[PDB]
Amino acid sequence: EPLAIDVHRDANCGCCKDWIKHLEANGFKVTDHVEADMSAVKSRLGVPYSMGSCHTGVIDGKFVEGHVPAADILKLRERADLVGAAVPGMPVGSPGMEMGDRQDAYQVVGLTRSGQASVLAEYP
């Protein structure tokens, strides 16, 4: 099939739409909607409490929380031990949150079912 991701996103959030455009430019087929019950979406997918962000994607059963770069979504897909990856919050400089030369340091955090956190990528 075409590579595809479904995105549940915060209402009135411009960065989520920009992140979707970066994914599309990376070849992802994206479907999305503004979310009515984001607590339900995140808790059903197993996104940890303080790892939430402004949108939640779902690809091949695994969650993509926040402004995860496309290349790290591909790494998520090929790690059988991981059920999701998160960039908590909204760090400036992450894809869809970019605003000039500046960047909040951030990590893409992979998560196992056992609750283990495994860093997929670090950005200065």
Footprint on this chain of Zn ion (rule: CB under 5 A) = 8, 18, 32, 35
Partner interacting with residue 13 (select from Zn ion, Cu ion, none; CB below 5-8 Å by kind): Cu ion
Q: Are 82 and 110 in contact (CB under 8 A)?
A: yes
Q: Tell me the three state secondary structure of residue 28.
A: coil
For residues 74 and 39, what is the distance between their CA atoms, to the nearest angstrom? 26
Partner interacting with residue 70 (select from Cu ion, Zn ion, none; CB below 5-8 Å by kind): none
Which lies closer to Zn ion via its Cβ, residue 41 or residue 83?
41
- CB-count exposure of residue 7 (10 Å: 0-12, 13-18, 19+): buried
Partner interacting with residue 54 (select from Zn ion, Cu ion, none; CB below 5-8 Å by kind): Cu ion
Q: Does 54 bind Cu ion (CB under 5 A)?
A: yes
Which lies closer to Cu ion via its Cβ, residue 6 or residue 112?
6
Question: What are the C-alpha distances in Å from 2 to residues 27, 59, 63?
Answer: 9, 12, 18
What is the total count of residues that contact Cu ion (CB under 5 A)? 6
Which residue from 23, 45, 87, 90 is in contact with Cu ion, where contact means CB under 5 A? 90
Which lies closer to Cu ion via its Cβ, residue 46 or residue 91?
91
Q: Are 54 and 31 in contact (CB under 8 A)?
A: no
- Kindly list the residues in this chain that would bind Cu ion in the complex (CB under 5 A): 13, 15-16, 54-55, 90
